[PDB]
A = this chain, B = another copy of it.
Amino acid sequence: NLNLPEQSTRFQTIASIHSNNCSFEILNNDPGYIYGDSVDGECRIAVAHRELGNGLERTGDDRFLFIFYALDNNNFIIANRHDGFVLQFLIANGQGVIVSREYQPNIHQEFTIQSINSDTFRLHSRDTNTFATVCWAQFNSWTKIVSRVDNPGAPNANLKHRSLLTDINMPQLPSLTPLQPLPRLTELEDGGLSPAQAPRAIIGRTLIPCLFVNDPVLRLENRIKQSPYYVLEHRQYWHRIWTDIFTAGERREYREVTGINNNAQNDMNKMINITIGADGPNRLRFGNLSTPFRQQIIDNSNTLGSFANTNYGTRTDIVNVFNSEFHQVRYARFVKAYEYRLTRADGSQVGTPWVVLDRKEMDLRTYPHNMAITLENVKIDNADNSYDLSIWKTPLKLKDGKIIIENHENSKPYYN
Contacts and interface: CB of A to CB of B under 8 A. Distances in A.
Interface of A: 1, 3-5, 70, 72-74, 112-118, 121, 278-279, 294-296, 298-300, 302-309, 386-390
A114 B113 CA distance: 35
B3 A299 contact: yes
Number of copies: 2
Contact of A72 (B70, B72, B113): B72
A411 to B, nearest CB: 10
A63 to B, nearest CB: 25
Nearest to A303: B3
A295 B74 CA distance: 8
Contact of A1 (B115, B296, B302): B302
Contact of A113 (B73, B121, B307): B307
Contact of A300 (B4, B299, B304): B299
Nearest to A6: B304
Contacts of A303: 3
A115 B294 CA distance: 19
A114 B309 contact: yes
A295 B302 contact: no
A391 B374 CA distance: 76
B117 A387 contact: yes
A69 B73 CA distance: 18
Contacts of A294: 72-74
Contacts of A1: 302
Nearest to A292: B73
Contacts of A298: 3
A114 B279 CA distance: 10
Given A295-B296, A299-B296, A299-B299, A305 B74 contact: yes
A104 to B, nearest CB: 18
A70 B304 CA distance: 11
A3 B309 contact: no
4 closest pairs, A vs B, by CB? A299-B299, A295-B295, A113-B307, A115-B307
A294 B307 CA distance: 21
A3 B302 contact: yes
A279 B116 CA distance: 9
A390 B118 contact: yes
Contacts of A306: 115
Given A3-B298, A3-B299, A5-B304, 20 more contacts: A3-B304, A4-B304, A5-B305, A72-B72, A72-B294, A73-B294, A74-B294, A113-B307, A115-B279, A115-B306, A115-B387, A117-B386, A117-B387, A117-B389, A118-B387, A118-B388, A295-B295, A295-B299, A296-B299, A299-B299
